């Protein structure tokens, strides 16, 4: 089964360059083009370019000529994209996709001078049958952050809201509706991970 696995999100300072990876499995790597796309919230998808692993042949959208450098490594069946001379207009989601249209999950790139800030996670216990609980994921930077409930266990009834940006920091909350029988009786947690700062925090929701 065809799979394209991109490397995780990145935070980079202006002026550096970054190299994103796209690891493929399930089809002969070099017998098909690998394309790259840029989706910047607001705008729509823009095509950066493509490479043919077999020989390294590349076709670039004139607008990314210089910004982006495409390479492939048959030995590991992995395509790379180097973006250089980075500035904030390069901040966006990047995708790798084949001509035969299979896509990577997308890589989130944030170009900024601000420093990494791990989030401060706070439980939200209420002050009926089912009961709603939440987690406040506060003052972190940059995006993204992954919020889970009971390590992916709690699934239906979850609402993780879009972060809001303020004073150079992001904040979101996630809510979860479970039953009177589970909480408080059992341990209930929200698992929050923030890659840029190498931090993972679980938080048990205990009655006030």
């Amino acid at each position: 089964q065809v799979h394209l696995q991109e490397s995780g999100p990145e935070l980079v300072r202006p002026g550096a360059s970054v190299k994103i990876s796209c690891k493929t499995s399930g089809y002969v790597f070099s017998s098909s083009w690998m394309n790259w796309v840029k989706q910047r919230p607001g705008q729509g998808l823009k095509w950066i370019g493509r490479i043919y692993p077999g020989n390294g042949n590349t076709n670039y959208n004139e607008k990314f000529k210089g910004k982006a450098t495409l390479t492939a490594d048959k030995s590991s069946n992995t395509a790379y994209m180097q973006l250089s001379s980075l500035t904030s207009v390069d901040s966006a989601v990047y995708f790798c996709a084949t001509s035969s249209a299979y896509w990577g999950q997308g890589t989130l790139l944030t170009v900024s001078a601000a420093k990494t800030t791990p989030p401060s996670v706070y439980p939200l216990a209420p002050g009926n049958s089912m009961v709603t609980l939440g987690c406040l994921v506060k003052g972190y930077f940059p995006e993204p952050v992954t919020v889970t409930w009971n390590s992916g266990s709690l699934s239906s009834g979850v609402h993780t809201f879009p972060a809001v940006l303020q004073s150079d920091l992001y904040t979101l909350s996630s809510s979860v509706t479970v039953p009177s029988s589970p909480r408080p009786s059992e341990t209930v947690t929200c698992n929050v991970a923030h890659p840029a700062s190498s931090t993972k925090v679980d938080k048990k929701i205990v009655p006030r």
């Binding site: 394309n35 796309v37 705008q43 729509g44 998808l45 823009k46 095509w47 370019g49 076709n59 959208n61 004139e62 607008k63 989601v93 995708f95 996709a97 001509s99 249209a101 299979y102 896509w103 999950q105 997308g106 401060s120 706070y122 439980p123 939200l124 216990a125 209420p126 002050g127 709603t132 939440g134 406040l136 506060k138 239906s156 609402h159 809201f161 879009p162 972060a163 809001v164 303020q166 904040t171 979101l172 909350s173 809510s175 509706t177 006030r208």
Partner: protein, 214 residues
């Protein structure tokens, strides 16, 4: 570059109905046209390639058609999982170029919000901060207003709101409104309220807590 343009940025339809998204190229692309579907979480997947051929795996209620500069994607038997943005892309000439998309909104039965208010975490109170969180969960339609009050008077500053995308499962919307103040300002007051006014009732749904209580 070839400009790909979609007829609208959004379309609404009821579960079970059929919809058609549309594109026109700025020059003939000789049937070299793909249709994609991007779900809220951001995953993308090919539905129709070369104008009318469906990708292996994609259900037959999905179909594409057209020629020259004009192309169509039709979905029959709409279902909740179809909530997403659909876009066309031409691969006739370089650089490949995409259309900006058309979000598909699904119509549904009116549903009142399920509202919850949560006072600050003791753990946050220490950090010197205090956020009052309020969740307006699972309602339909989209529009909804929340009003916050402290010791009974309307409070507006420090209120940030956030809407989710239409739910792929029950087709509703949710929203969380967070009122943030300093610790000092939070102990200075006693009563907190979150009121949500929505299409489904004239009497708003009020949720509150009083720091004296429990």
């Amino acid at each position: 570059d070839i400009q790909m343009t979609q007829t609208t940025s959004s379309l609404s339809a009821s579960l079970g109905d059929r919809v058609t998204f549309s594109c026109s190229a700025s020059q003939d692309i000789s049937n070299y046209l793909n249709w994609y579907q991007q779900k809220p979480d951001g995953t993308i997947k090919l539905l129709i390639y070369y104008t009318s051929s469906l990708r292996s795996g994609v259900p037959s209620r999905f179909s594409g058609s057209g020629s020259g500069t004009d192309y169509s994607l039709t979905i029959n038997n709409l279902e909740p999982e179809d909530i997403a943005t659909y876009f066309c892309q031409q691969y006739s000439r370089l650089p490949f170029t995409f259309g900006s998309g058309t979000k598909l909104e699904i119509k549904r039965a009116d549903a009142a919000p399920t509202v919850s208010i949560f006072p600050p975490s003791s753990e946050q109170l220490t950090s010197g901060g205090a956020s009052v969180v309020c969740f307006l969960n699972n309602f339909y339609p989209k529009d909804i207003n929340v009003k916050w009050k402290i010791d009974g008077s309307e409070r507006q500053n420090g209120v940030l709101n956030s809407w989710t995308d239409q739910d792929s499962k029950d087709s509703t919307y949710s929203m969380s409104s967070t009122l943030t103040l300093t610790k000092d300002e939070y102990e200075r007051h006693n009563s907190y309220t979150c009121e949500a006014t929505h299409k489904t009732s004239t009497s708003p749904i009020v949720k509150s807590f009083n720091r004296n209580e429990c």
